[PDB]
Amino acid sequence: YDQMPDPRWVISMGSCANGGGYYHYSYSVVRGCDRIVPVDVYVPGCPPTSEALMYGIFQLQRKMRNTKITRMWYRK
Amino acid sequence: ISDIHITRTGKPLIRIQGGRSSLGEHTATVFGATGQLGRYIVNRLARQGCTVIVPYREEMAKRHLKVSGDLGRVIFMEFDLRNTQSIEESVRHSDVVYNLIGRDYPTKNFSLADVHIEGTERIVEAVAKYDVDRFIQVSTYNANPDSTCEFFRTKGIAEKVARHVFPETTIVRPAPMFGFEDRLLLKLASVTNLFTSNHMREKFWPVHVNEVGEALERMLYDDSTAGQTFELYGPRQYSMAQIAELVDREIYKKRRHINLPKPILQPLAELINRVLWWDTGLSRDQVEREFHDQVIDPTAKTFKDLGMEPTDISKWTYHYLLPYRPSTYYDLPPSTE
Amino acid sequence: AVQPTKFAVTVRQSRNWADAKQRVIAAYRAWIRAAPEIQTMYSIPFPVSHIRTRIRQEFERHRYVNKLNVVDVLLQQSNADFQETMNFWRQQSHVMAFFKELPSNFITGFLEGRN
Amino acid sequence: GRPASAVMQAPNRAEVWSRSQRPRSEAMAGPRFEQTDFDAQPRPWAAIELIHKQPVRWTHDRIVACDGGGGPHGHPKIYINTDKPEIATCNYCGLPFANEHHRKYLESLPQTSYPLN
Amino acid sequence: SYPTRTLANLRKIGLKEYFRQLLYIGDTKYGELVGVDKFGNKFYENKEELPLRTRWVDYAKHDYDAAHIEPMWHAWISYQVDTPPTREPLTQIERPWAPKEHVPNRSFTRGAYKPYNTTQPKIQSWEPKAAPR
Amino acid sequence: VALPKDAPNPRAIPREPVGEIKQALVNPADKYQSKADNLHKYGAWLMSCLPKYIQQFSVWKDELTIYICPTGVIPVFSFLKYNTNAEFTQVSDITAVDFPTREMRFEIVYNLLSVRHNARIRVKTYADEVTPVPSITSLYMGANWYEREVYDMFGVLFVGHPDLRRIMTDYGFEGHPLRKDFPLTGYTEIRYDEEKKRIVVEPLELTQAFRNFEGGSSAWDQVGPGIDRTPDTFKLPTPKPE
Amino acid sequence: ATPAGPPPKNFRLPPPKNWDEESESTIDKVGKYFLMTEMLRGMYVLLEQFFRPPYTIYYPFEKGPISPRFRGEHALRRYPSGEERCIACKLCEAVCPAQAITIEAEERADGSRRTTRYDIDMTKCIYCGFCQESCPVDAIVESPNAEYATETREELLYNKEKLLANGDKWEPELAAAIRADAPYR
Amino acid sequence: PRNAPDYNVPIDIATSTFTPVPKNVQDGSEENVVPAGLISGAPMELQARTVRIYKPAKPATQSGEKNTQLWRMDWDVLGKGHRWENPLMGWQSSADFMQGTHLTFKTKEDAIAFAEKQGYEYFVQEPNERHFRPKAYANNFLYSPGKLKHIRTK
Amino acid sequence: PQDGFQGTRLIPTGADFQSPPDPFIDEGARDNAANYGVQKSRSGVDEDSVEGRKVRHYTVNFGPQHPAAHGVLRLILELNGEEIVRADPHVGLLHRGTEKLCEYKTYMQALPYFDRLDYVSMMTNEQVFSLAVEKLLNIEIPPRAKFIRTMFGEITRILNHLMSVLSHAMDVGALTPFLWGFEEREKLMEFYERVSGARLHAAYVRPGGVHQDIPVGLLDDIYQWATQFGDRIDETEEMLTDNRIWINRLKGVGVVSAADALNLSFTGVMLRGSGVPWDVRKSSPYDAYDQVEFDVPVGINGDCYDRYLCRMEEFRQSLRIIHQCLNKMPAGPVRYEDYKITPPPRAAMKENMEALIHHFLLFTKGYAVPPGDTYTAIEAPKGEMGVYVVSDGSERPYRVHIRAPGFAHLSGFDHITRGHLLADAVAVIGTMDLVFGEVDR
Numbered sequence A: 001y002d003q004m005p006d007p008r009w010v011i012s013m014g015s016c017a018n019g020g021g022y023y024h025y026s027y028s029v030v031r032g033c034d035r036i037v038p039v040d041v042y043v044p045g046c047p048p049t050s051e052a053l054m055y056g057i058f059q060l061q062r063k064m065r066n067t068k069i070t071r072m073w074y075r076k
Numbered sequence B: 001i002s003d004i005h006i007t008r009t010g011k012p013l014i015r016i017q018g019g020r021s022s023l024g025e026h027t028a029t030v031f032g033a034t035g036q037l038g039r040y041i042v043n044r045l046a047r048q049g050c051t052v053i054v055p056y057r058e059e060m061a062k063r064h065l066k067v068s069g070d071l072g073r074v075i076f077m078e079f080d081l082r083n084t085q086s087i088e089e090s091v092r093h094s095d096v097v098y099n100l101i102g103r104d105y106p107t108k109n110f111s112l113a114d115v116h117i118e119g120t121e122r123i124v125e126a127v128a129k130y131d132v133d134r135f136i137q138v139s140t141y142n143a144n145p146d147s148t149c150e151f152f153r154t155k156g157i158a159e160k161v162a163r164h165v166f167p168e169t170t171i172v173r174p175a176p177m178f179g180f181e182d183r184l185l186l187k188l189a190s191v192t193n194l195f196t197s198n199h200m201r202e203k204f205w206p207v208h209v210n211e212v213g214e215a216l217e218r219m220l221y222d223d224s225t226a227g228q229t230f231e232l233y234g235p236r237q238y239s240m241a242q243i244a245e246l247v248d249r250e251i252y253k254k255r256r257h258i259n260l261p262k263p264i265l266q267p268l269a270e271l272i273n274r275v276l277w278w279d280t281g282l283s284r285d286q287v288e289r290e291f292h293d294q295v296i297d298p299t300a301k302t303f304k305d306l307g308m309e310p311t312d313i314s315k316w317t318y319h320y321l322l323p324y325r326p327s328t329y330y331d332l333p334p335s336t337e
Numbered sequence C: 001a002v003q004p005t006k007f008a009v010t011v012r013q014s015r016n017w018a019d020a021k022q023r024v025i026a027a028y029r030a031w032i033r034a035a036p037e038i039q040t041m042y043s044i045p046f047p048v049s050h051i052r053t054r055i056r057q058e059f060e061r062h063r064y065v066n067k068l069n070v071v072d073v074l075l076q077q078s079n080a081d082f083q084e085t086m087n088f089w090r091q092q093s094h095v096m097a098f099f100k101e102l103p104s105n106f107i108t109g110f111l112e113g114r115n
Numbered sequence D: 001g002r003p004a005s006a007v008m009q010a011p012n013r014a015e016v017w018s019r020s021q022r023p024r025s026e027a028m029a030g031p032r033f034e035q036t037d038f039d040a041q042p043r044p045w046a047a048i049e050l051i052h053k054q055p056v057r058w059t060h061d062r063i064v065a066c067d068g069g070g071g072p073h074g075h076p077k078i079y080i081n082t083d084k085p086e087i088a089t090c091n092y093c094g095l096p097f098a099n100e101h102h103r104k105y106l107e108s109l110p111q112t113s114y115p116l117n
Numbered sequence E: 001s002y003p004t005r006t007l008a009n010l011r012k013i014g015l016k017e018y019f020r021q022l023l024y025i026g027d028t029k030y031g032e033l034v035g036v037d038k039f040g041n042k043f044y045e046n047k048e049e050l051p052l053r054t055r056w057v058d059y060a061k062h063d064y065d066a067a068h069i070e071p072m073w074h075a076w077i078s079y080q081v082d083t084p085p086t087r088e089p090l091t092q093i094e095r096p097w098a099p100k101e102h103v104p105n106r107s108f109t110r111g112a113y114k115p116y117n118t119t120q121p122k123i124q125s126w127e128p129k130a131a132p133r
Numbered sequence F: 001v002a003l004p005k006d007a008p009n010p011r012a013i014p015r016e017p018v019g020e021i022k023q024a025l026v027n028p029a030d031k032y033q034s035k036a037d038n039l040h041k042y043g044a045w046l047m048s049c050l051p052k053y054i055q056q057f058s059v060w061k062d063e064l065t066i067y068i069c070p071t072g073v074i075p076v077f078s079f080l081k082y083n084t085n086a087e088f089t090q091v092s093d094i095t096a097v098d099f100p101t102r103e104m105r106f107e108i109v110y111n112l113l114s115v116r117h118n119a120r121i122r123v124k125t126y127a128d129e130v131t132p133v134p135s136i137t138s139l140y141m142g143a144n145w146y147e148r149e150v151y152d153m154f155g156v157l158f159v160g161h162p163d164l165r166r167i168m169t170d171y172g173f174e175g176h177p178l179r180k181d182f183p184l185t186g187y188t189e190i191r192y193d194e195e196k197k198r199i200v201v202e203p204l205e206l207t208q209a210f211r212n213f214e215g216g217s218s219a220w221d222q223v224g225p226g227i228d229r230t231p232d233t234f235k236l237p238t239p240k241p242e
Numbered sequence G: 001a002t003p004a005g006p007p008p009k010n011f012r013l014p015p016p017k018n019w020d021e022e023s024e025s026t027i028d029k030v031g032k033y034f035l036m037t038e039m040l041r042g043m044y045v046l047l048e049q050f051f052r053p054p055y056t057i058y059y060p061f062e063k064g065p066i067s068p069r070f071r072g073e074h075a076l077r078r079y080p081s082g083e084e085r086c087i088a089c090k091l092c093e094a095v096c097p098a099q100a101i102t103i104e105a106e107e108r109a110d111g112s113r114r115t116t117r118y119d120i121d122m123t124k125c126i127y128c129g130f131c132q133e134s135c136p137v138d139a140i141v142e143s144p145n146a147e148y149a150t151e152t153r154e155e156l157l158y159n160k161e162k163l164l165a166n167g168d169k170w171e172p173e174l175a176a177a178i179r180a181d182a183p184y185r
Numbered sequence H: 001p002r003n004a005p006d007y008n009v010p011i012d013i014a015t016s017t018f019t020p021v022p023k024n025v026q027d028g029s030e031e032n033v034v035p036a037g038l039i040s041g042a043p044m045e046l047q048a049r050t051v052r053i054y055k056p057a058k059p060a061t062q063s064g065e066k067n068t069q070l071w072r073m074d075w076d077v078l079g080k081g082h083r084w085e086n087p088l089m090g091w092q093s094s095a096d097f098m099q100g101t102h103l104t105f106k107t108k109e110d111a112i113a114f115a116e117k118q119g120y121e122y123f124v125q126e127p128n129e130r131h132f133r134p135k136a137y138a139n140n141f142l143y144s145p146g147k148l149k150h151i152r153t154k
Numbered sequence I: 001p002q003d004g005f006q007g008t009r010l011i012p013t014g015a016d017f018q019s020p021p022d023p024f025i026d027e028g029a030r031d032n033a034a035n036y037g038v039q040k041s042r043s044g045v046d047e048d049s050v051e052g053r054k055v056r057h058y059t060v061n062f063g064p065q066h067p068a069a070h071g072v073l074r075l076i077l078e079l080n081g082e083e084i085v086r087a088d089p090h091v092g093l094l095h096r097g098t099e100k101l102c103e104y105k106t107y108m109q110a111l112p113y114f115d116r117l118d119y120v121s122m123m124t125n126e127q128v129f130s131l132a133v134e135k136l137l138n139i140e141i142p143p144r145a146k147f148i149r150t151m152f153g154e155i156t157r158i159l160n161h162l163m164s165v166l167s168h169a170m171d172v173g174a175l176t177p178f179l180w181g182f183e184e185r186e187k188l189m190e191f192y193e194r195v196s197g198a199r200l201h202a203a204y205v206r207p208g209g210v211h212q213d214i215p216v217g218l219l220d221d222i223y224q225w226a227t228q229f230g231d232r233i234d235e236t237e238e239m240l241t242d243n244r245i246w247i248n249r250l251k252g253v254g255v256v257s258a259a260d261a262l263n264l265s266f267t268g269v270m271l272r273g274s275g276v277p278w279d280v281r282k283s284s285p286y287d288a289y290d291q292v293e294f295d296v297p298v299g300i301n302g303d304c305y306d307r308y309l310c311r312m313e314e315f316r317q318s319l320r321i322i323h324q325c326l327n328k329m330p331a332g333p334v335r336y337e338d339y340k341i342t343p344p345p346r347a348a349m350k351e352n353m354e355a356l357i358h359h360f361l362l363f364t365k366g367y368a369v370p371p372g373d374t375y376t377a378i379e380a381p382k383g384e385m386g387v388y389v390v391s392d393g394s395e396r397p398y399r400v401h402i403r404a405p406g407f408a409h410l411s412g413f414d415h416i417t418r419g420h421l422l423a424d425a426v427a428v429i430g431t432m433d434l435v436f437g438e439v440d441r
Ligand SMILES: NC(=O)C1=CN([C@@H]2O[C@H](COP(=O)(O)OP(=O)(O)OC[C@H]3O[C@@H](n4cnc5c(N)ncnc54)[C@H](OP(=O)(O)O)[C@@H]3O)[C@@H](O)[C@H]2O)C=CC1
Pocket: A076, B031, B032, B033, B034, B035, B036, B037, B038, B056, B057, B058, B080, B081, B099, B100, B101, B102, B103, B104, B110, B115, B138, B139, B140, B141, B174, B175, B176, B177, B178, B183
C-alpha cells in the first residue's frame, strides 16, 4: 500500500477485510484491514456479489467526481 | 496518570487505560492536525481511547488519521477558519482544544497575520463561548509582539489574544522540529534547497516532534499546566551548518548550497511564493527568520516540568535519513560518529 | 525429499548434560556473532550492544533449568528463531516487536487502578 | 438535539416505551452528530402505538386461536382464554380479543387499551 | 451492438434519443415501457434481446445510482419476479408507517446513518446527598 | 428468439404424479458387520507380530485403530510400509488431539492408506510438552509438513525431523493455539502505528468480548451408551450350565 | 499402486514405437511442423468467437439474476398491523456462527416481550441465512438488496432503528420472497 | 518471602495495564513438576492468576445432572478489565483473554496436575453432597393420633 | 515425562534403523532424476554448512503479491541464474484458526467454515464434513439428498476445474480460454444461487441431507445447460491440447513417479497423473456415486501435460455423471426424517408442539453427536479431502482437523521443481491446483 503512488484509494471488500468477519475471534486475524490502512469505501457481504463490488467502485468514482482538487488549493 | 481525572469545570472522568478499545474519557478537538505535528498528538489521544475531532480542509489528506483510533473515535469535521459555525460545531463537545494551525508563508487568501491572529481569535472565542476546560495553543519559538519577522510577531500577538480571552491557556513554544516528514532533516537531505541568504549559521535547539506530541499529551493530564507557557526545545544548540553536517555524514551525499545576499534573495523569494502554488520553502519572511537566532525565553516551563528529557537530533539521523542513502552506502550501519 | 533450508538443523536429543552444556554455548555464541548482521538486515537504529544485551537476557531466563527434556525444547526454539531471523523470513516489525525499549509498589499500583 | 426528528422517540410517539430504552435526545447528541441530517436518520414508527389502534376482535367462544393470520407466514398457533372481564391479548402479535359476555362491562370503562369498536 | 440491430433501434427511437443512450447506457436499446418508480425511474422490457438484457432501467437522475430503484422494481430488474410492480398485489397493503418518500443509500452525504446505543446504561451511580452536619 | 427445431420446452413436459412414498429404516452400522471379523483379525495379527509396541486396537465401523508406544514409531511404521499384507505407502494425515486430563496431553494420530488393498488404518501414540516423538520423515516424504503442523499447533517435537519450524502461525508467534488452554482469540493483536510508522504488537483488547454460549449445553445426556457390536470370535467363551 | 488381485487386463503399456514406426507421412509431419497447422486452427476458433454475441450486461442499467432465496442485507419485519414481529427469544443470537447479533429485551410498557436493543455487526456477519432460518415468527430476514456499500464502518453497525427502517422500506419484496420460498422451508 | 508480590518480574509483549503482579513464576528448577508454563509461550499473567477447580452444581431450574459429571477449571474475574461498555454501541468490551475459556477434567487430581504443570494459582472447592434419606409415598397418609399439624393437599 | 528430566534411553530415530544397501545387485548412485544434479550443492566449491553460511543464492520472494502466486503464497525461490536450486514455500498467510474456531461452535455452526476452505469447491467441502457427522450420528440420509449431493458434487467439480485449469493456462500466457470458461461458471453459480441464496458460500449440504429442496424449474435448466457444455469443453480443448507452445510448456515438466507420488501424500490428479488408478469415489463409494457410471482419467508420464489431459477428461466425465443424476432423481424428502437431528419444516414448527421444541433445541443447543472419532475422506476436485472429527457426546466437536489435498501437494513442490526454470515453477503451481483457504485452514 505504501508503494502505491498518489492519488491512491483503498476499497475494503468483504466482512473479513471490514471487521474480521467469521474469523473475528481468532488469534491470527486482523479485525478489519482499517487497523492497517485507511479505507475509502466498504462493501458488505461474504462474499459481496460481483455487482455489489461494482456498486462500491461506482461509489468511489462518485467520490472522485466530487473531489475538489484545483478548487481546493484555491481555498488553500 | 490515574484512573480518575477531574477537569477544570469539575466533571470527573473514570478511565479504563489501555488499548484502542478502552475509555480515555477525554473529548479533544485538534485544529491543524493534518500537518506534521498533528498526527502525533492525535495518535497519542486516539490509541488510548479518546474521542478526537479533526477539523479538516482537504478530504484526501486527512485519511491517515483514522487508522489511529477505533470505530467512532476519530470524528472528521469539515471546517474553514472564516466559517465560525464550523469552528463552534467542532469545539463544543470538548474538554480540550488544541490549536496547531499555522503557516510559514503567506497565501493569496491568508496573510501570516490572518491565519495566526484571526484564526486564533475565532478558535479562542469559541473556546470561551462554550466553556471548554483546556486550551493548548501552539505558538512558535521567538514569538514576540514586538518582533519584526512576520512569523515571530503574529504568533506572538495571538499568544496575547488567547490569554486575554481565555486566561487558562497553556501556551506552547516548540523549537524547530525534526522527525519523520520533518521540514528540517528532509530539506537538508533534499536537492531543491539550494538557495540561502546566511551561510546556514543560524542557531537553534532542535526538538524531536515525537517528544512534542508526548509533551502535549502530558499537558492534558497535568491540569496544573493550565495558564502556563512552555518552551519545548532540545538538549543542544546547533547551527544549520552543524545539522547539515550530520545529514551529509548519514546520507553520504555531501549536499551543497548557493548563498545569496539577502537584499537580492528576499525579493526573489517573495516572487516565487507569489507565483507558485506549492510550498517552495522560499518567502520574504522565511529569509528574515533565516537571519534570526533562537532565544529560550526564561520564566517559561520546559520538558523537565513535564518530567521529560529530550533526546539529541544526532541519535535520530540514521532512522529518518536512511531512505536517502545511495544504494552503495545503504547497507551500512548507523554513522554513530 | 525437499531440501532443508539454509540454517535448518535436524532435531536431535541431548545425549547428556555435557552435550546440552556445549550446545547452549554454541547457540549463545552463534546469536551474538550474528548481532552485527541482524542490525543491517533489519536496519536497527540502536547499536549492536543493545541487541546482544537482549540475547543475553533471553538466555538468562532459562539459566536455572535442570531438566534435559526442557533444555532440548529450548534449544529447538532458539534454532528455529535463529534460522527464521538469518534467512530474513521475519521482517523489521517482528524484530522490533522483540525490543520493548507492572507497578513497582503496591501503593503505586493501587492509585492508578491495578497497575 | 435541535429538530423534532432528533428528539421524538418515533414519528408516531414522543416518549420511550421501555424501561431501558435510551431517549433519542440522549443518543443523537455528541460529536458524532454535529454535521448530520436528522430526518435522514432511521426513525421508525413505534409499534406500541400502532397495535393499540387495532379494534377488539369480539367472540363468544371461551378460547380463541391466533396464528398471526399469515398461515405459515404468521406465528406459532396459540390459544387465548377470554374469561376475565378484560381485553385478552395475543402474546405474539398483540391483537386484542374480548368475550361478548363482558361487552357491557368493557363499554362502561372510562378508558381501555384497544378500541372496543 | 451490431449493424442490423443498431440501425433498426436507431430508426425506432430517433437520433436525439440515440445520442442520449450513447451517454448513459452506451448502448442503443428499444423496448416498451413497463412502469415508473416513485423516483421517476423508467423500466422497459424486450424479450427479443440477449439473455439478462431483456429488462433494463432508464435512471431518472443524471447522477444515476443502482440504489435509486424502488424495492419491488429491484426484484423485477433482477429477474426475481416476472410480474411487474404495476400488477403485483403486495404493493397494495396499506402501511401508514412506510416511507412516503424515496429513501436511497445515504452514504457519502451528511444524511449518512450514524449508529448508537439504544439501551440505557447498566449501572447507576449514587447522586451524593451530603446531609447537614 | 430463433428457437432450435428439435429442442422442446422441457418445463412444458408433464411429470407423472408421485404419491405415497415408502422408505425402509436402516441402521447404517449393519453393513459393517460383514467385515467386523476381518478387521479384528488384522488388528490382532499386528498385535502378535509386533507385541513390543502395540498396546491395543479398536474397531468401530470400518476403521481399525492401532495404539502403540512412542518408542515404536519407526518399527511399526516400517512394518506398515513394507510388509506384503501391509502396503500402507501413504500417510494421509498426521494430527494431534489435546487431552489435558491425561499426563501425556497429546494424542498423535496418523492416518495411512493402502491403495493396493483399498485399506485404511489409524495409528495413535502419545506425547506431552516435553516428551518428543520419532519422526517418520525417513519413511514418508509427505509427512514432513504434517509433523511441522503438529509442532506448530501443539508443540510436539519430532526427533529426527529435518527443518522443523513453524508452518501455520505468524513469524514471531509465541504459543500453541490448538492447545485447549490457549485462549480462542490469543494474547496479542497488531495494528499499524502512526507514531512509529510500522506494525506494532499490543495486548489484546476486544470491542465486544467473545460470548461463549457453552453453558447452554443440555442438562440431560442425549446420546446414551450405544450398543456393543463385537463379533463372537473376539469375545471370551461363556461357561455353559451344569 | 494398482488394485490387489489379478493385475488389470492390458495395464502394461505396449512397447514404445520407433521413429520409423510412426505411421505419419513425411509430407504431413513436415507440413504440420513448418505450416504451424494446429495453431492456425486455434487462431480460426477465435475468429468465430469474434462473430458471436457477447455475454456482457450493462450494469447498473441491467442486473444479473437473483432468486427468492437470495441473502442480502438484514431487515426487521412487522405484522399487517404495524406491530413488530420480533419477540426477543434470542434464537438467532444463539445460532449465529459469527456472533454478529447482540439483543437486549425487557417487558414493554404494555407488558409485551419486545427487544430494547437489536444490533447486527454487518462486518462480522457471514450472510449464511441461519438467523432467518431459525426465526419462529419470520422477523429477521435477509433482503434481496446487495447494493448498500458505505463510506465508513460505523455505517455498517445496524441498530434496531436501522433494521426496522429496512423492513419498513423493503416489506413488498420481503413478503414476495417469503411467499415464493415458504413451501420449501 | 512468604508469597510476596515480586515487583521485579519482567514484562513481555502480552503485559497490559490489567496484568496482575505475580508472586512467583516457573523457572524450571522446581522438583518433579514439568515447567510447562515456562516453555508454553503463554504470558506471565497466567502465573499471576488463580484458577478455580470445582464440579459445577446442578442448576436450580432443571433436574438433569449431566453438567455436574466432570471437573471444570475457570479463570477468576479480576477487578478491572473484565467488562466495560463500548462508547459507540454499548457492546461489552473486555481485556481479559481467559474470560471465555474453561477446561474439563475427569478427576480432581487431573485438574491439580495440569495447573501445577502450567504454573497456575489454583483454588479447589469440594462439591456439596446430597444427604440421603428414604422417601416413602405412604408417609403422605400416616395416621395421626392427635392434632393434625398440617392438612396435606397432594 | 519425569524420566526425561535426567538423561535416559534415547528415543529411537529413523537414522538408527537405517540399513546398508546390498552391493551385489545395487546399480547406480541415483535411481531418481529428481535428485540427479538439479538441486543445491551442484556448484560452488564448499558446502553451505561451514564457510558457506556467509553467501546466498539469488533469492526472490515469489508472492504473496503476485499473480502466479494466485493469492497468498510466499514462495521463497533460490535462483542459480534463471534456474531454481531450492524452493521454500511459506504458508500460513491465510491461516485464520478455523480448526480452533470449530471447537466453540455447534456442528451446524461449523459447517459454513468448510465452505471457506477450498473456496471454489464449497459444496464438496460441505459434503466431507456432512458425511463425517452423519457417520458419527449413525443415520442414513434419504435417496433424494444423496442424488442432489452427487449432482451438485459434480457441478462443483466442473466449477473447480474451470477455475483450476484455466487459471493455470492464464499463468502460462493463454488469456482467452479463461474468459470463455468464466461464463460457464457464471452460469453454474445460478444453480447455486437458486437452491441456496448465495453464489459462492451456499451452506447447502449439511449433516442429514440438504438445507432446502431444489426449486421446480432447476432440473430443466441444468439439463439445458448440459446440452451445450460439451461444446464449451471442445473449444478450450481446441486452443491447448495440440498447441505446440502448450505442449512444450507442460510436457516433461513437474514429473513425479508413481512410487514417489504415493510417498509424497499426493492424491487426485497429482496421483492419477503418475499412472495409478485411484479414485475415492470408486474405492469408497459415497452418496450416489456407486449408482452412476463414469471413467477415471489416468496419465502415464506424471507431468503437467498428462495432468492437464486428465482434468480435461474429468470435465466430460462430470457432465456424464450430471446427466445420470438428472435422470435418476427420486422423490422423497431431502432431509433425514428425524427432527431431533434436522430442523422441522417451518409449517410444522408453527403448528405442532414437538416440532417447536425440536426447532428451538436444534438452533440453540444443537444436536448431540454420539462420542467417538472418525476419518472420513472424499474425492474432492483437488484430491483426497478428509476430515478427522472427534466427538465428546456433546453438541460441540472436541476436535475438527481438515486434511487438505493442496497442503500435501505444496509440500512436494521442491521435490519436483528444483532444477527447472522460473517459468516452470509457474507451470507447476497451476498444475498442482492450490487454494490457500485449504492449505492454511
Ligand atoms: N514544525 C516546526 O518546525 C515548527 C512548528 N511550529 C508550529 O507548530 C504548529 C504545527 O507544526 P507543523 O505540524 O510542523 O506545521 P504544518 O505547517 O505542517 O501544519 C500546519 C497546520 O495548519 C493548518 N493550516 C494552515 N493554514 C491554515 C488556514 N489558513 N486555515 C486552516 N488551517 C490552516 C494546516 O492544514 P492544511 O494541511 O489543510 O493546510 C496544517 O494542518 C504550527 O502552528 C507551526 O507554526 C513552530 C515552530 C517550529
